[PDB]
Amino acid sequence: AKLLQILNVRVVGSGERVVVLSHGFGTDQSAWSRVLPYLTRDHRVVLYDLVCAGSVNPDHFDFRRYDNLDAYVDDLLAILDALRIPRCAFVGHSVSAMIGILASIRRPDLFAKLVLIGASPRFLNDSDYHGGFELEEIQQVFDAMGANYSAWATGYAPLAVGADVPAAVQEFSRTLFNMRPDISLHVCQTVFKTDLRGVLGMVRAPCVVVQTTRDVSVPASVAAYLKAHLGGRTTVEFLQTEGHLPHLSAPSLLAQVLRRALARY
Structure with missing residues (x-):
């Protein structure tokens, strides 16, 4: 109830087919603004901000509570239960792809389909697993985020967007600079300590994994790993564009995949 305001x-559009759009790190629900008009004629669309978004009063961020992703899953489930939604499709980017996987395992009745963008079960490398990051590398990232958040964000924004799309770099920067720096670091630390590999087989919902030509945080092999280990009927949909945030940089192309993936579920 109060969560709906915080x-x-x-809730926009209308229809029997309900879709939840859940943003990732460094953005808020406004990141969906360009894809939204492609969905609202045929779907009731639920949008919300993660508690870590700069568009949320940062004094709600309880560092103790949000020490793991299950706490974010709790917020998502509380929202959907408050809205009395019994069944939906879920589109998650980045940390929200992880939240969606966990949420679908907790509540398989509620999640009829997952669409995962910029998705990984684990960012750190392991003995027989390529996540894309080494321990020493993330240590340096965390240091930079603390030492000079502004400089870190300035360098990260174009790398994340990937494609040379100035408006998208500006827009991602807008929200990245809006995140409280301590919250931003904490969320990044939480993501980097999360390893979902063990639970992927528990996902029952069909899943579409969206893969772009290159993503600075998600090696190509990860999409293949997700397709092999997610427990539901999983396909990989390739977008002919570069970057981690195709909803910002290639919304038309992404909207094609969303319209097709959300046609029946």
């Missing part, structure tokens, strides 16, 4: 919950 996390800026919005």
Whole structure:
């Protein structure tokens, strides 16, 4: 109930087929603004901000509570239960792809389909697993985020967007600079300590994994890993564009995949 106000919950469009759009790190629900008009004629669309978004009062961020992703899953489930939604499709980017996987395992009745963008079960490398990051490398990232958050964010934004799309770099920067620096570091630390590999087989919902030509945080092999180990009927949909945030940089192309993936579920 009060969660609906705190996390800026919005329900737009209409229809029997309900879709939840859940943003990732460094953005808020506004990141969906360009894809939204492609969905609202045929779907009731639920949007909300993660508690870590700069568009949420940062004094709600309880570092103790949000020490793991299950706490974010709790917020998502509380929202959907408050809205009395019994069944939906879920589209998650980045940390929200992880939240969606966990949420679908907790509540398989509620999640009829997952669409995962910029998705990984584990970012750190392991003995027989390529996540894309080494321990020493993330240590340096965390240091930079603390030592000079502004400089870190300035360098990260174009790398994340990937494609040379100035408007998208500006827009991602806008929200990245809006994140409280301590919250931003904490969320990054939480993501980097999360390893979902063991639980992927527990996902029952069909899944579409969206893969771009290159993603600075998600090696190509990860999409293949997700397809091999997610427990539901999983396909990989390739977008002919570069970057981690195709909803910002290639919304038309992404909208094609969303319209097709959300046609029946």
